[PDB]
């Protein structure tokens, strides 16, 4: 009871042009479209162009009870009909889920597609009504969190929380609470929201405003950067584009191993100490977590990733810089605060 | 910084002979072998092309194989992979992805022996239950107690983590006497002290293959075959929990408390599955299964019968208790 799938050789992707794109759209209600260009004259880019088809061919045969499609668009033969979906980025996949338009930031691997799209299925907004749903809730930490105290899900508050949820779906979860008991713990008056940070215990009320659906928005974007963000990839490339003036402060931490769990905790603790400084925050890596990644990574950077890392890696030029060893939460702190330009 | 790698077209794969075998397992420290639809066949060579140029420097070298050496390299299962490094065949359990094949080969290429000094790290060696381990207490790898030990740990590299400390003060907080190791069970706080027999070595194997089967163990991608197939009855109990989600992370603690009461029972060997690692199975448990895999979920699947009963669960409020779990899972008999 353990059949991994294999292809069937069945051709499920679609070509979507500017002729079946609205009949298309009609046929699912989860629709992913690999947005490409044509291969370049050099079987080079070919070769690589046709594993991208094998792998989403696999997860359209993975998904096609769930009511996913995958399609194709080319961006100089159906220029036109990409502009008009909102295929902007180029070589990026898109996923249509009613009126919502997702760009996919994450590994263009079988397994995160799937599990991309399984999460863009789920609906944004889950509800916590029990004690010991909101203990389990609070034990959450690696990722953003917003939870909101609402008097109802016909209530307009509710709607406004719910369309901020769509916006951002499905990176960000969002958590809604009908409970009086529940809002009690967090100190949460009605239609008040808490946005919690990245391995934060501590959260921050979002203000209130007339348009709360923008405001959620706006706070959001404004908060999206953690003094501590876990590598995902599923928004792999997404973390990777909010640079700090084009470097990026990185640390490998394998969380399964003793010595990476032990610095891991010090990443915690020095979350703490420095949340009051945005210009700090360390994206850890864990390189369990991304197998395929870490010879590149022990090649460019010149470092070990079986012992914890922590360095300075620029975005542009791959150069980088690494802190010389366990440190402590302290010693590690002003490390990073003598490497400023 | 964050190129992922993409596929080079060059076969670095070999087409291994009965005249090839000799040098190319001294060409590479570690040997990854595929023992091998028309069509199905050619596109798992493109993962393990993919797998030979990531680990192209790790000194990592992938083959296929003709049946001449299948009986001397100890080739068995019909289409698998086995790993050669040193006088060890390691055969592999797991994923056929890029994903896992790669994780398995760095583990492998690991040290089946990780030391513990200090005690902020062995802190952090207690918060790892997700899997068995063990830790013992030597003073030096010149003692012949911590020969037995190593050996044992190369016998389940990379399945089950060695652990060993010459410290004297992190022995102290475990109450681990000189030469003395300790066997945890996975989601199990407190351990067991392997009795310090005779011939050392093998004890060590032979109570960690007697204690191989948790009363809760966790599914991992690398190892998901080793699991489900250290089989009773042909039956499996089976859990579905996202340990990311809060619905499913309260069912979890649910199971981490039946893990605690419930050594008594030989057969409650529950298998936690959370299908946040397994997306590409996930369609296929929701049909085979006929659950919503988005909530909760435990039941006992029948290999034998491809069969399931599952507790049917309305909503979060409906979860079990610990004992509740636990009863009705023993009033499942045949």
Do not use: C
């Not at 959450?140 to 369309?163: N, P, Q, R, T, V």
């Not at 709360?212 to 973390?239: A, C, D, G, Q, W």
């Not at 210009?279 to 590149?296: G, K, M, N, Q």
């Amino acid at each position: 009871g353990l059949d991994f799938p294999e292809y069937d050789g069945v051709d499920r992707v679609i070509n979507v042009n500017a002729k079946n794109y609205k009949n298309v759209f009609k046929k699912y209600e989860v629709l992913a479209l690999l947005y490409h260009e044509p291969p370049e004259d050099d079987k080079a880019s070919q070769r690589q162009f046709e594993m991208e088809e094998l792998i989403l061919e696999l997860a359209a045969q993975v998904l096609e009870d769930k009511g996913v499609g995958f399609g194709l668009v080319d961006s100089e033969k159906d220029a036109a009909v990409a502009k008009k979906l909102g295929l902007t980025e180029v070589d990026s996949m898109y996923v249509f889920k009613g009126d919502e338009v997702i760009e996919y930031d994450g590994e263009f691997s079988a397994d995160t597609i799937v599990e991309f799209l399984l999460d863009v299925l789920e609906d944004p907004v889950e509800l916590i009504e029990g004690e010991r749903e909101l203990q389990a809730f609070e034990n959450i930490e690696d990722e953003i969190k917003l939870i909101g105290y609402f008097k109802s899900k016909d209530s307009e508050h509710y709607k406004a929380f719910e369309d901020a949820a769509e916006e951002f779906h499905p990176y960000i979860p969002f958590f809604a609470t009908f409970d009086s008991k529940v809002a009690k713990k967090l100190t949460l008056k009605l239609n008040e929201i808490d946005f919690y940070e990245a391995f934060m215990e501590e959260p921050v009320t979002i203000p209130d405003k007339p348009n709360e659906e923008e405001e959620i928005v706006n706070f959001v974007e404004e908060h999206r950067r953690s003094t501590l963000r876990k590598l995902k990839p599923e928004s792999m490339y997404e973390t990777w584009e909010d640079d700090m003036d084009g470097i990026h402060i990185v640390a490998f931490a394998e969380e399964a191993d003793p010595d990476g769990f032990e610095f891991l905790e010090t990443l915690k603790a020095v979350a703490q100490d420095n949340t009051e400084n945005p210009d700090l925050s360390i994206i850890w890596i864990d390189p369990d977590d991304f197998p395929l990644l870490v010879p590149y990574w022990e090649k460019t950077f010149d470092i070990d990733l079986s012992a914890p890392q922590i360095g300075v890696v620029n975005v542009t030029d791959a150069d980088s810089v690494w802190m010389e060893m366990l440190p402590s939460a302290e010693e590690l702190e002003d490390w990073l605060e003598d490497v400023l330009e």
